[PDB]
Amino acid sequence: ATLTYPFHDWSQELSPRYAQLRASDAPVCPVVSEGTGDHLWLATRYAAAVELLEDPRLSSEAAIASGAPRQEPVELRAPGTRADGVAMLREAGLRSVLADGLGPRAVRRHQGWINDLAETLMSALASREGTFDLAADFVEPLSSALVSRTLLGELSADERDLLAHCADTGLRFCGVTHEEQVHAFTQMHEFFLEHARRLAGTPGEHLLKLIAEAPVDHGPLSDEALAEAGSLLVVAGFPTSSGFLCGALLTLLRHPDAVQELHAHPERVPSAVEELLRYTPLSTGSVKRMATEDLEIDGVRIKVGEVVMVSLEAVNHDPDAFEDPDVFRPGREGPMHFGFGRGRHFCPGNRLARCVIEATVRAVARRPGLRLAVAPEEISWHEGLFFRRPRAIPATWHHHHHH
Numbered sequence: 001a002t003l004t005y006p007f008h009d010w011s012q013e014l015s016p017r018y019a020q021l022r023a024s025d026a027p028v029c030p031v032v033s034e035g036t037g038d039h040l041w042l043a044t045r046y047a048a049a050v051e052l053l054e055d056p057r058l059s060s061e062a063a064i065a066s067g068a069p070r071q072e073p074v075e076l077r078a079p080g081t082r083a084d085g086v087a088m089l090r091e092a093g094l095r096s097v098l099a100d101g102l103g104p105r106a107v108r109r110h111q112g113w114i115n116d117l118a119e120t121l122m123s124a125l126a127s128r129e130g131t132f133d134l135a136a137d138f139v140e141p142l143s144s145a146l147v148s149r150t151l152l153g154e155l156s157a158d159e160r161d162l163l164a165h166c167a168d169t170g171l172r173f174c175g176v177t178h179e180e181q182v183h184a185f186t187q188m189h190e191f192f193l194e195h196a197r198r199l200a201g202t203p204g205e206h207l208l209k210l211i212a213e214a215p216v217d218h219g220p221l222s223d224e225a226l227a228e229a230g231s232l233l234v235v236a237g238f239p240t241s242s243g244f245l246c247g248a249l250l251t252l253l254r255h256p257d258a259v260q261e262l263h264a265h266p267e268r269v270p271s272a273v274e275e276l277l278r279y280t281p282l283s284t285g286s287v288k289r290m291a292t293e294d295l296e297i298d299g300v301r302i303k304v305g306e307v308v309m310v311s312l313e314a315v316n317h318d319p320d321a322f323e324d325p326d327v328f329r330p331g332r333e334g335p336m337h338f339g340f341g342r343g344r345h346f347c348p349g350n351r352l353a354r355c356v357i358e359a360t361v362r363a364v365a366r367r368p369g370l371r372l373a374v375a376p377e378e379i380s381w382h383e384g385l386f387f388r389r390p391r392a393i394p395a396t397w398h399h400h401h402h403h
């Protein structure tokens with residue numbers, strides 16, 4: 001009877017399993033990894049997720065460590081490496097560099113070109129008669145520019161392609177062999193071992209530069225430590241940004257009334273950004289934590305060493321938190337969504353993410369003539385990715401009204 005994980009819901013149609021688990025009485029339900037056979041706890045209710053992700057007895061670092069019970073088929077690392085950029089920066093005493101390079105000051109430095117670039121990419125599409133692909137010709141250049149200009153430094157087109165390929169090949173439940181999946185991480189690691197210092201020295205204020213230039217104990221930060229930072233930034237910023245912006249465009253274009261309302265009321269755009277983060281399902285897996293001591297939540301005993309997963313998508317679609325959870329309702333006042341997680345490990349990139357998301361929403365809201373070119377069921381999805389992404393977003397112009 002035991003349920004295997006994940007649920008193979010690669011499109012935006014969420015698996016019926018979440019509702020089945022949310023209806024269970026317990027705050028966590030047992031599942032078994034389809035890949036490793038590890039037994040895992042899974043939370044799907046908003047209430048349970050708040051308590052679990054606020055608990056200091058559950059450790060992210062410990063669930064990332066090699067050997068932990070895991071949901072993914074292969075370890076997400078170059079073998080023999082720590083591959084925990086967050087722990088790295090904490091160890092190096094560099095938490096403030098990340099906060100400073102992703103905080104509201106950083107956003108203020110980048111929002112100008114981010115908005116100009118969103119507008120450049122969208123106005124460039126106004127010339128297309130017939131069907132064009134918003135994924136290839138809007139999301140990928142915008143997400144590539146975000147990663148290069150705010151995170152890694154000046155990337156060549158080939159380097160961008162390599163890093164994007166490593167993320168798509170490594171961050172998967174299925175669709176590639178184990179050796180190909182390992183090779184994604186070793187290729188990314190070897191790339192940054194060679195190039196991270198050079199990238200950190202390219203012009204601009206990208207985060208890798210700030211990290212490489214920050215004083216730490218005993219000489220400059222090592223090539224291995226910079227490499228660990230590089231791989232963290234790729235997996236944190238690249239497939240997330242491209243997957244989310246793709247899914248958010250699909251949500252907007254499936255709700256032309258919402259787009260038309262934002263066209264008439266730009267002051268409503270920030271509320272729509274937050275609802276996009278609740279409503280648009282990004283990940284096919286779960287955030288995870290390891291218990292560092294026995295604990296009991298609402299009757300369930302979790303033993304030290306066991307791993308607790310929280311499905312943010314399940315949580316964001318919990319009808320006990322959100323009335324009509326499967327309705328895209330941009331003026332929803334609350335409650336607070338789990339699109340960026342919760343607690344200690346709440347996404348440190350959230351301000352930069354919101355900045356790019358808002359730029360994208362406004363580029364659409366200015367042009368309510370932008371339409372999906374096919375029915376939503378006619379969109380094809382990359383199967384097996386941790387971060388959902390359609391193969392293409394075919395779009396077309398009904399008219400060219402803009403302001």
Ligand code: HEM
Binds near residue numbers: 277287
């Ligand atoms: C420039 C873009 C981004 C950067 C630099 C970034 C950075 C990061 C980093 C470093 C972490 C790990 C934090 C930790 O474990 O302490 C993280 C976690 C997270 N990020 Fe972001 N991120 C970006 C974009 C996004 C986007 C677009 C989303 C969702 C739409 C997102 C959602 C999340 C979530 C839910 C977590 C929590 C994972 C957990 O609890 O283990 N991020 N991000």
Ligand SMILES: Cn1cc(C[C@@H]2NC(=O)[C@@H]3CCCN3C2=O)c2ccccc21
Binds near residue numbers: 064083085171386
């Ligand atoms: C942002 N983010 C952090 C982790 C944990 C761990 N931390 C790392 O630095 C390395 C780099 C390569 C893989 N890593 C990890 O999986 C993670 C996993 C899946 C998706 C996104 C993730």
Ligand SMILES: Cn1cc(C[C@@H]2NC(=O)[C@@H]3CCCN3C2=O)c2ccccc21
Binds near residue numbers: 071282
């Ligand atoms: C919505 N959302 C969920 C996560 C957790 C991440 N999701 C996965 O599928 C993979 C599978 C193996 C481990 N994973 C994780 O820890 C996440 C990270 C960054 C940005 C957004 C995120």
Ligand SMILES: [Zn+2]
Binds near residue numbers: 403
């Ligand atoms: Zn108008």
